[PDB]
Amino acid sequence: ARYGATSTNPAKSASARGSYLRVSFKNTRETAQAINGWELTKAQKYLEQVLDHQRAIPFRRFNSSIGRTAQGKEFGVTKARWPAKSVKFVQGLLQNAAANAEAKGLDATKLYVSHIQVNQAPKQRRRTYRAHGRINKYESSPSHIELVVTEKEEKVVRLTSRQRGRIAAQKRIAA
Amino acid sequence: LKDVVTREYTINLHKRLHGVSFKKRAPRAVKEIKKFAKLHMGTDDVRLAPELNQAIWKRGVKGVEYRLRLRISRKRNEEEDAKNPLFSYVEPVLVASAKGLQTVVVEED
Amino acid sequence: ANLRTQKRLAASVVGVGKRKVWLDPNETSEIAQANSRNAIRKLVKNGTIVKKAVTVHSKSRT
RNA sequence: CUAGACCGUAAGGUCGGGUCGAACGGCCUCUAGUGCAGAUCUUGGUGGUAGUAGCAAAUAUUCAAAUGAGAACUUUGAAG
Ligand SMILES: [Mg+2]
Ligand SMILES: [Mg+2]
Ligand SMILES: [Mg+2]
Ligand SMILES: [Mg+2]
Ligand SMILES: [Mg+2]
Ligand SMILES: [Mg+2]
Ligand SMILES: [Mg+2]
Ligand SMILES: [Mg+2]
Ligand SMILES: [Mg+2]
Ligand SMILES: [Mg+2]
């Protein structure tokens, strides 16, 4: 309960969550944005193609000094990747949400991802060992993920005295 | 057509391993026969007989034969099948030389 | 299965190195149950674990 | 907390809504460990850099089977 800001019918919606999942937040954010708004079966088929390296996930925000790929032409970008670990976490939650929709009684052919949001989980700490006896952090960036599927849904005017007189003068000569 | 079939192929491993670094000629010869059986049977799942692995690795990581006679059998995938229903099982054929042989269909009966 | 323990046991029982110990890959369940030196000894005599003869080093050229 | 309202030149004061759950204000005086943007200030927390620099010494791995939700890395066999 207490998801992000959603504007849909809760009675016509099914939800899913995953917290503290040790998957890159930056890569999960782009995977989430690549299916935000899509139809459920289209989103699930697309993520399977990302696992097969046929289609890519467009990297829009966390993408500085990423390599270029041809498979970004589908979305108008040069930089796109295939975050397999991020995809598996997302499609696990999509499968859970479709299970909730089936349990709730929701009609699966009309489902679509209405809200998907990836947040930063608390980081997991490790050390790394540097030159000249230095120690730096070596830290994971886990993801809080939450998504919701929904069915696709199918003046006193004020006038002055001279304004009313003109409207009166228009009407008494109109045919 | 006939989804189950077995055929004799000669692979020119010389032209496929040309210019490849010595420590991965035999591993790459494994991958070339995998791409070879996929290009001739249309199956993603390619399985290599361990005796075929012996034939690839016979002269070390560096001495893969220039030519190699293969028997590629496309069979029906079972036992909790994967995304594909057919697979390729590649066997070695023991011949005196691997030169002068064309592709021939070998009958199951 | 983790037959690492059985391969260690078979080497010490037979008296050779682990590199000369053969465990039947078709009899994994039987070797797995053998946890004692007496059970590895029983596996040696019924052929499940064999001694894997030495690599020759000829002196013909010498 | 609040691109909602009001008062004061200002320091500030007051109100509405949301959240919350147990104490807190106005006025006349008393008192101070009483007001922060800086001090390579102190402690803690968080950024951009950035999914980046990199994870390249020690010749080298491969095939099948088993187990498993999942096997480049586990086990066994074969090979090198
Ligand atoms: Mg740049
Ligand atoms: Mg670079
Ligand atoms: Mg780049
Ligand atoms: Mg270091
Ligand atoms: Mg060269
Ligand atoms: Mg209370
Ligand atoms: Mg003070
Ligand atoms: Mg300050
Ligand atoms: Mg890099
Ligand atoms: Mg090395």
XYZ file of C-alpha atoms (C1' of nucleotides) and ligand atoms in Angstrom:
436
model
C 0.000 0.000 0.000
C 0.882 3.716 -0.342
C 2.307 3.699 -3.859
C 3.393 6.766 -5.817
C 1.092 9.367 -7.322
C -1.391 7.416 -9.459
C -4.449 8.744 -11.306
C -6.484 5.642 -12.209
C -9.429 3.689 -10.850
C -8.229 1.543 -7.906
C -11.144 -0.870 -8.403
C -9.933 -1.381 -11.994
C -6.245 -1.610 -11.075
C -3.809 -4.251 -9.852
C -0.441 -3.513 -8.294
C 2.893 -5.126 -7.460
C 5.968 -4.184 -5.435
C 9.543 -5.210 -4.842
C 11.784 -3.587 -2.242
C 15.548 -3.658 -1.600
C 16.171 -5.547 -4.848
C 19.915 -5.653 -5.557
C 19.652 -4.443 -9.144
C 21.170 -1.241 -10.557
C 18.855 1.704 -9.935
C 20.016 3.547 -13.061
C 19.421 0.539 -15.322
C 16.098 -0.325 -13.675
C 14.903 3.266 -14.124
C 15.426 3.066 -17.888
C 13.847 -0.398 -18.133
C 10.821 0.938 -16.243
C 10.563 3.973 -18.526
C 10.732 1.731 -21.611
C 7.429 0.000 -20.731
C 5.676 2.916 -18.989
C 2.284 3.181 -20.685
C 2.546 0.076 -22.871
C 0.058 -2.761 -23.131
C 0.873 -5.646 -20.787
C 1.390 -8.357 -23.413
C 3.264 -5.917 -25.661
C 5.502 -4.962 -22.730
C 6.138 -8.608 -21.846
C 6.963 -9.595 -25.436
C 9.243 -6.561 -25.746
C 11.200 -7.470 -22.597
C 11.698 -11.006 -23.927
C 13.186 -9.475 -27.079
C 15.520 -7.387 -24.903
C 16.713 -10.645 -23.330
C 17.366 -11.957 -26.862
C 19.203 -8.736 -27.900
C 16.676 -8.079 -30.676
C 15.328 -4.880 -29.109
C 17.091 -2.560 -26.693
C 16.159 -0.424 -23.699
C 16.623 3.277 -24.576
C 18.946 4.919 -22.052
C 17.642 8.460 -21.728
C 18.838 9.962 -18.424
C 21.713 7.891 -16.981
C 23.458 7.472 -20.294
C 26.662 9.530 -20.384
C 29.477 7.660 -22.198
C 27.312 4.663 -23.097
C 28.049 2.943 -26.385
C 25.932 3.495 -29.470
C 23.710 0.862 -31.041
C 21.495 0.477 -34.087
C 18.583 -0.781 -31.977
C 17.986 2.729 -30.596
C 16.446 3.834 -33.904
C 13.162 2.336 -32.656
C 13.010 5.172 -30.105
C 15.080 7.910 -31.751
C 18.208 7.562 -29.606
C 21.764 6.463 -30.272
C 22.383 5.090 -26.767
C 20.493 1.971 -25.707
C 21.442 -1.126 -23.724
C 20.131 -4.546 -22.650
C 19.925 -4.592 -18.830
C 19.166 -8.300 -18.436
C 19.209 -8.182 -14.626
C 16.850 -5.182 -14.621
C 14.524 -6.817 -17.168
C 14.158 -10.017 -15.122
C 13.159 -8.097 -11.980
C 10.616 -6.020 -13.920
C 9.006 -8.952 -15.744
C 8.797 -10.830 -12.453
C 6.725 -7.971 -11.054
C 4.654 -7.753 -14.245
C 3.884 -11.462 -13.872
C 2.920 -10.844 -10.233
C 0.685 -7.887 -11.147
C -1.070 -9.910 -13.853
C -1.607 -12.571 -11.186
C -3.209 -9.946 -8.933
C -5.355 -8.756 -11.848
C -6.523 -12.325 -12.494
C -7.250 -12.798 -8.782
C -9.065 -9.447 -8.648
C -11.078 -10.388 -11.740
C -9.505 -7.879 -14.124
C -9.687 -8.554 -17.859
C -6.138 -9.211 -19.071
C -6.531 -8.315 -22.763
C -7.283 -4.682 -21.829
C -4.474 -4.294 -19.282
C -1.708 -1.722 -19.619
C 1.052 -0.370 -17.394
C -0.522 2.800 -16.006
C 2.098 3.573 -13.346
C 5.622 2.220 -12.907
C 8.121 3.848 -10.557
C 11.650 2.834 -9.547
C 13.104 4.450 -6.437
C 16.509 4.304 -4.790
C 16.748 1.674 -2.071
C 19.229 2.067 0.806
C 22.690 1.199 -0.443
C 24.697 -1.879 0.530
C 28.210 -1.090 1.717
C 31.477 -2.759 0.748
C 35.055 -1.514 0.605
C 37.549 -1.228 -2.215
C 41.307 -1.010 -1.747
C 43.262 1.740 -3.490
C 46.878 2.713 -4.019
C 48.973 4.091 -1.139
C 46.940 2.467 1.631
C 43.599 4.084 0.852
C 40.113 2.634 1.266
C 37.118 3.799 -0.763
C 33.484 2.756 -0.816
C 32.292 0.003 -3.171
C 28.544 0.321 -2.910
C 25.483 -1.244 -4.485
C 22.554 0.866 -5.696
C 19.453 -1.274 -5.116
C 15.983 -0.489 -6.409
C 12.554 -0.034 -4.900
C 10.132 -0.996 -7.690
C 6.353 -0.572 -7.785
C 3.992 -0.884 -10.743
C 0.234 -0.797 -11.399
C -1.754 -2.282 -14.300
C -5.224 -1.007 -15.255
C -7.797 -1.675 -17.972
C -7.911 0.639 -20.969
C -10.965 2.865 -20.514
C -13.091 3.914 -23.487
C -20.525 28.897 -17.434
C -22.342 32.135 -16.593
C -21.375 34.789 -19.152
C -21.493 38.445 -18.093
C -22.240 41.172 -20.636
C -22.479 44.927 -20.173
C -25.449 47.089 -21.144
C -23.875 47.958 -24.502
C -22.989 44.321 -25.218
C -26.574 43.148 -24.664
C -27.880 46.003 -26.809
C -25.698 44.877 -29.710
C -26.927 41.279 -29.334
C -30.473 42.661 -29.290
C -29.699 44.695 -32.419
C -28.226 41.632 -34.143
C -31.279 39.470 -33.428
C -34.009 41.871 -34.586
C -32.479 42.010 -38.090
C -31.279 38.395 -38.356
C -33.187 35.998 -40.596
C 9.434 -30.212 -44.971
C 11.056 -33.026 -42.978
C 11.859 -31.526 -39.586
C 13.777 -34.675 -38.572
C 16.766 -35.256 -40.853
C 20.439 -36.235 -40.737
C 23.082 -35.036 -43.200
C 26.828 -35.195 -43.807
C 28.641 -31.855 -43.934
C 32.275 -30.892 -44.417
C 33.185 -27.690 -42.567
C 36.179 -25.662 -43.750
C 37.564 -24.785 -40.333
C 40.659 -23.325 -42.022
C 38.780 -20.319 -43.410
C 36.847 -19.865 -40.145
C 39.880 -19.937 -37.821
C 42.068 -17.857 -40.154
C 43.908 -15.155 -38.225
C 42.558 -16.215 -34.823
C 44.840 -16.113 -31.784
C 46.310 -19.474 -30.862
C 44.897 -19.825 -27.332
C 41.298 -19.801 -28.612
C 41.361 -21.630 -31.970
C 39.821 -24.789 -30.509
C 37.213 -22.857 -28.428
C 36.307 -20.817 -31.518
C 36.144 -23.954 -33.671
C 33.534 -25.128 -31.158
C 31.551 -21.929 -31.757
C 31.939 -22.083 -35.554
C 30.399 -25.564 -35.736
C 27.641 -24.188 -33.497
C 26.978 -21.415 -36.022
C 27.403 -23.977 -38.821
C 24.688 -26.334 -37.572
C 22.451 -23.335 -36.892
C 22.900 -22.097 -40.471
C 22.117 -25.520 -41.984
C 19.366 -26.810 -39.677
C 17.819 -23.524 -38.542
C 18.021 -24.559 -34.877
C 19.282 -22.340 -32.073
C 19.919 -25.327 -29.780
C 23.095 -26.982 -31.083
C 24.519 -29.900 -29.095
C 28.000 -31.294 -29.711
C 28.980 -34.899 -29.085
C 31.894 -35.228 -26.615
C 33.764 -37.359 -29.157
C 33.339 -34.470 -31.612
C 34.953 -32.299 -28.932
C 37.799 -34.830 -28.864
C 38.188 -34.474 -32.644
C 38.328 -30.670 -32.372
C 40.793 -30.776 -29.478
C 42.900 -33.704 -30.762
C 45.936 -31.575 -31.701
C 45.635 -29.152 -28.789
C 44.159 -25.674 -28.614
C 46.294 -24.671 -31.604
C 46.030 -27.539 -34.086
C 42.411 -27.742 -35.209
C 42.056 -29.582 -38.510
C 41.663 -27.525 -41.676
C 38.626 -29.578 -42.723
C 36.225 -31.656 -40.654
C 33.493 -34.113 -41.594
C 30.359 -33.664 -39.493
C 27.080 -35.533 -39.159
C 24.340 -33.076 -38.189
C 21.095 -34.681 -37.021
C 18.121 -32.387 -36.470
C 15.918 -34.032 -33.840
C 12.814 -33.212 -31.808
C 13.478 -31.429 -28.518
C 11.887 -33.073 -25.469
C 12.471 -33.411 -21.699
C 11.135 -29.991 -20.647
C 11.768 -28.396 -24.022
C 13.136 -24.867 -24.397
C 11.849 -22.008 -26.574
C 12.541 -24.133 -29.672
C 11.096 -27.576 -30.535
C 14.020 -28.831 -32.660
C 17.735 -29.151 -31.945
C 20.932 -30.104 -33.762
C 23.160 -32.949 -32.557
C 26.531 -32.909 -34.325
C 28.593 -36.113 -34.457
C 32.026 -36.750 -35.986
C 32.385 -39.178 -38.869
C 35.591 -41.222 -38.864
C 37.099 -41.005 -42.352
C 40.598 -41.484 -43.720
C 40.574 -37.927 -45.081
C 38.109 -35.034 -44.935
C 38.698 -33.983 -48.557
C 36.560 -34.539 -51.634
C 33.264 -35.195 -49.836
C 30.018 -33.438 -50.752
C 26.860 -32.938 -48.726
C 24.785 -36.132 -48.703
C 21.557 -36.975 -46.894
C 21.897 -40.099 -44.750
C 18.736 -42.142 -44.246
C 17.541 -43.158 -40.793
C 16.572 -46.611 -42.116
C 25.705 -34.295 -6.020
C 29.010 -33.352 -4.393
C 31.227 -36.423 -4.918
C 34.330 -34.375 -4.039
C 34.465 -36.141 -0.672
C 34.214 -39.583 -2.290
C 37.043 -38.804 -4.722
C 39.194 -37.746 -1.767
C 38.196 -40.927 0.080
C 38.842 -43.174 -2.933
C 42.323 -41.708 -3.429
C 43.281 -42.374 0.196
C 41.697 -45.848 0.202
C 43.210 -47.052 -3.081
C 46.541 -45.363 -2.399
C 46.900 -43.186 -5.503
C 46.311 -39.542 -6.263
C 42.957 -37.960 -6.975
C 44.082 -37.603 -10.608
C 44.052 -41.426 -10.844
C 40.588 -41.925 -9.297
C 37.653 -42.824 -11.538
C 34.061 -42.567 -10.306
C 31.289 -44.016 -12.453
C 29.217 -41.144 -13.924
C 26.291 -43.545 -14.409
C 26.357 -44.531 -10.712
C 26.297 -41.091 -9.070
C 23.571 -42.000 -6.556
C 25.440 -45.099 -5.350
C 28.703 -43.184 -4.875
C 26.802 -40.385 -3.102
C 25.506 -42.782 -0.435
C 29.034 -44.115 0.202
C 30.291 -41.823 2.967
C 32.580 -44.222 4.865
C 35.951 -45.657 3.894
C 34.369 -49.108 4.161
C 31.664 -48.117 1.663
C 34.235 -46.662 -0.746
C 36.142 -49.938 -0.333
C 32.989 -51.854 -1.291
C 32.641 -49.609 -4.352
C 36.241 -50.349 -5.371
C 35.709 -54.122 -5.459
C 32.440 -54.117 -7.431
C 34.023 -51.976 -10.166
C 32.262 -48.675 -9.456
C 35.600 -47.040 -8.536
C 38.635 -48.147 -10.554
C 42.331 -47.360 -10.276
C 42.817 -45.544 -13.634
C 46.197 -46.919 -14.853
C 49.328 -44.768 -14.979
C 50.378 -42.448 -17.800
C 53.293 -44.178 -19.514
C 56.737 -42.554 -19.706
C 58.697 -44.819 -22.036
C 62.474 -45.044 -22.212
C 62.446 -46.463 -25.758
C 63.944 -43.294 -27.227
C 66.246 -42.983 -24.208
C 4.822 20.297 4.540
C 1.899 23.902 1.698
C 4.294 29.035 -6.461
C -3.056 29.567 -0.353
C -4.555 34.438 2.517
C -3.531 38.685 5.806
C -0.322 42.314 8.988
C 4.711 44.699 9.674
C 9.873 49.039 6.019
C 12.149 44.796 8.508
C 13.762 41.288 12.256
C 9.085 38.551 12.068
C 3.857 37.751 13.379
C -1.033 35.616 12.241
C -4.550 32.372 9.623
C -6.604 28.257 6.105
C -5.536 23.057 4.196
C -2.654 18.398 4.788
C 0.091 15.291 8.170
C 0.361 14.142 13.285
C -0.616 12.526 18.491
C 0.270 15.365 24.165
C 1.546 19.074 25.492
C 1.847 24.486 24.283
C 0.967 29.988 24.101
C -0.449 35.947 24.735
C 1.013 40.007 28.144
C 4.226 42.395 32.530
C 8.904 41.241 34.315
C 13.639 37.972 35.344
C 17.685 35.136 33.246
C 21.165 33.173 29.424
C 25.378 27.828 27.006
C 20.034 33.132 23.006
C 19.822 34.073 16.427
C 25.158 31.457 11.333
C 26.653 31.098 4.873
C 31.520 31.069 5.380
C 36.244 29.677 9.967
C 41.032 24.053 4.067
C 35.014 25.172 10.846
C 32.979 20.022 13.963
C 29.666 15.535 13.437
C 26.393 13.059 10.377
C 23.845 12.592 5.700
C 23.757 13.316 0.270
C 25.268 14.826 -4.854
C 27.510 15.899 -10.006
C 31.588 13.259 -11.735
C 29.040 8.111 -13.191
C 26.657 3.216 -14.896
C 32.165 6.370 -15.635
C 37.925 5.088 -14.454
C 38.212 0.425 -14.315
C 37.445 -5.447 -12.743
C 43.999 -6.696 -18.838
C 50.774 -9.850 -14.537
C 51.092 -15.550 -13.106
C 50.359 -19.647 -21.368
C 43.839 -22.195 -21.155
C 40.323 -23.760 -21.736
C 36.375 -27.131 -24.252
C 32.257 -30.982 -24.605
C 28.303 -33.936 -22.521
C 25.680 -35.680 -18.247
C 23.887 -34.856 -13.149
C 21.926 -31.407 -9.558
C 19.190 -27.088 -9.480
C 14.162 -21.915 -9.978
C 18.591 -20.404 -12.057
C 25.247 -23.318 -14.243
C 31.102 -19.871 -18.041
C 32.325 -20.759 -12.599
C 29.110 -26.858 -8.394
C 29.875 -32.506 -9.144
C 31.303 -36.536 -12.353
C 33.221 -38.361 -16.939
C 35.967 -37.178 -21.597
C 39.568 -33.962 -23.761
C 43.303 -30.156 -24.014
Mg 31.149 12.502 -22.592
Mg 35.760 5.202 -21.946
Mg 31.128 4.768 -24.769
Mg 42.555 -1.311 -5.853
Mg 46.651 -11.661 -37.952
Mg 0.827 9.870 22.949
Mg 26.495 30.241 21.646
Mg 25.206 25.843 8.086
Mg 33.495 0.888 -19.172
Mg 47.100 -15.613 -16.310
